[PDB]
Write a protein that binds this ligand. Structure first.
Ligand SMILES: NC(=O)c1ccc[n+]([C@@H]2O[C@H](COP(=O)([O-])OP(=O)(O)OC[C@H]3O[C@@H](n4cnc5c(N)ncnc54)[C@H](OP(=O)(O)O)[C@@H]3O)[C@@H](O)[C@H]2O)c1
Ligand SMILES: NC(=O)c1ccc[n+]([C@@H]2O[C@H](COP(=O)([O-])OP(=O)(O)OC[C@H]3O[C@@H](n4cnc5c(N)ncnc54)[C@H](OP(=O)(O)O)[C@@H]3O)[C@@H](O)[C@H]2O)c1
Ligand SMILES: O=c1c(O)c(-c2ccc(O)cc2)oc2cc(O)cc(O)c12
Ligand SMILES: O=c1c(O)c(-c2ccc(O)cc2)oc2cc(O)cc(O)c12
Lengths: 261, 260
């Protein structure tokens, strides 16, 4: 019985959904009615927990291990999703890594560590999603507010990895149009996950000398709403984008920073 | 001292043997800068650019280096410094173009483009920061297809320049501790070998038009009713790298003659 904004009958796949923004995204698509493929690379136990979380709320989920840096595994990841659930309608490219360093000291190895996942990875998730998805499908990739809207010292490598994503999705929308598939990206600001705590200090002048609580409480004042971004905030937006009602939002980056910018 | 001029400054330009790079190199020479001319394959053409720059009364040298290989960017920059004593201006221009529907884009094709257009440029900037003297200038090369122009089947190349757009905004923050400015020029359809390489992809049923019809059509994109030429890019690069250009920092200048 079709409820506006619900994903009953649909099958969704979220990369890196064992934990973080991706876990919230994966559970949320489950609450909306979708069956979900929970992708992980390292966090087996957390992915299990997401699968259980989704089954308990009246849906179905499977956990598939795949390093998204390896394109042959993306291909296999999408092949397995379609095999198991019958068809795939929604792909969310979420997996990502963070990076900091003054330009002068950025190494080749660090460049490739970051770009092979954030950019090359998301790119081929997009290719494999286009190849496997049903007509009228949905593809969301993950950018960041540091791509265009926010300028952070020593953050050039990461910012550019996502700036690439920002261009990808606008043109992806053109190509993917012949399968009636919309492509967008979400570009979150400070969102409280393990990534956030790992680096909150790089975003603030003399941040090492503040606590982890105090730093989070400063990031909260960036938005005029005076609160942090939460994995749920992204999930709410991804959830609209991937519904029937979000169709006319296509080829776009949505900055999700609560009005910081 | 004459304004907009570069007397006593030293410049480098990646892939300046031909195309846009060549016009940048010669123009920096015309303004008084000494030039290191980089090429990967185009030896004869690079030696001519050198002659052009000596002909207008400056000095230049050709250096072979493959901008995909960082250990070769590192050498390019050491050799420049070793030859002229110091380096003030670095233009990262070398690029390649690509077309393909998402469904067909290969691992090899991705790497081909990004190793040069993105990774390459990134490390050209790194080595430029390392080598440049106080108050130097770095300019990278982007595209009007990065943000301003949306072409089907152009996702890979568009993405590869979007990265550069984000790079220079942040690079400007880190590069300020040496008073170096970083920007990027983003040309529209500019008439080089690359233009002829892809001009049919920018136009519905492009293979049904001659190349000269395609160029005439691309001239109507500007409200000025002419094509972009390598000198158009060269002029703006010239101004960005002058003392008078200092207050343009961390920006991407789209040069399409008003097409966007
Ligand atoms: N946190 C923020 O404020 C913020 C801001 C802007 C953008 N973002 C973007 O939002 C996305 C998620 O961020 P987050 O904060 O949730 O990060 P996080 O807490 O560090 O989570 C990282 C996620 O990526 C997965 N992952 C890592 N390497 C992988 C690989 N090789 N293959 C497949 N999956 C891999 C991880 O799974 P495993 O545990 O199995 O490795 C995990 O699920 C990222 O793209 C990030 O760039 C976050
Ligand atoms: N022309 C346009 O309409 C247009 C539009 C937007 C952006 N752009 C950008 O503007 C820049 C100039 O391009 P163009 O139009 O002059 O193209 P072009 O005529 O094909 O010139 C390409 C230049 O790239 C150099 N290059 C290629 N591979 C290299 C490598 N591995 N290492 C070092 N150098 C290498 C070439 O040197 P060798 O031949 O010796 O290898 C040559 O000097 C590019 O970055 C392009 O992306 C051009
Ligand atoms: O950790 C973060 C952070 O602290 C801030 C921030 C802190 C204080 C401010 O005054 C303004 C912003 O923004 C962020 C933006 C991101 O995309 C990712 C982050 O991890 C943070
Ligand atoms: O070749 C090109 C081309 O033809 C056009 C074009 C634009 C509008 C038109 O109406 C017709 C053509 O733009 C371009 C933009 C680029 O960055 C690179 C190109 O190579 C072209």
């Amino acid at each position: 019985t079709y409820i506006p904004g619900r994903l009953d009958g649909k099958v969704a796949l979220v990369t890196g959904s064992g934990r973080g923004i991706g876990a919230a995204v994966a559970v949320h698509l489950g609450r909306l009615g979708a069956k979900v493929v929970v992708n992980y690379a390292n966090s087996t136990k957390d992915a299990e927990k997401v699968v259980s979380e989704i089954k308990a709320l009246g849906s179905d989920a499977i956990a598939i291990k795949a390093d998204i840096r390896q394109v042959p595994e993306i291909v296999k990841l999408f092949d397995q999703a379609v095999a198991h659930f019958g068809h795939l309608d929604i792909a969310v490219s979420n997996s990502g890594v963070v990076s900091f360093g003054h330009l002068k000291d950025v190494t080749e190895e660090e460049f490739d560590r970051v770009f092979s996942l954030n950019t090359r990875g998301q790119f081929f998730v997009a290719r494999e999603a286009y190849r496997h998805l049903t007509e009228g499908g949905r593809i969301v990739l993950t950018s960041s507010n540091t791509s265009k809207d926010f300028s952070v010292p020593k953050h050039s490598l990461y910012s550019g990895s996502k700036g690439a994503v920002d261009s990808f999705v606008r043109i992806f929308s053109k190509d993917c149009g012949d399968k009636k598939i919309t492509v967008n990206a979400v570009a979150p600001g400070g969102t409280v996950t393990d990534m956030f705590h790992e680096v909150s200090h790089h975003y603030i002048p003399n941040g090492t000398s503040y606590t982890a609580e105090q730093r989070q409480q400063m990031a909260a004042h960036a938005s005029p709403l005076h609160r942090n971004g939460w994995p749920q905030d992204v999930a709410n937006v991804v959830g609209f984008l991937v519904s029937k009602e979000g169709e006319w939002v296509n080829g776009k980056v949505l900055t999700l920073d609560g009005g910081a910018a």
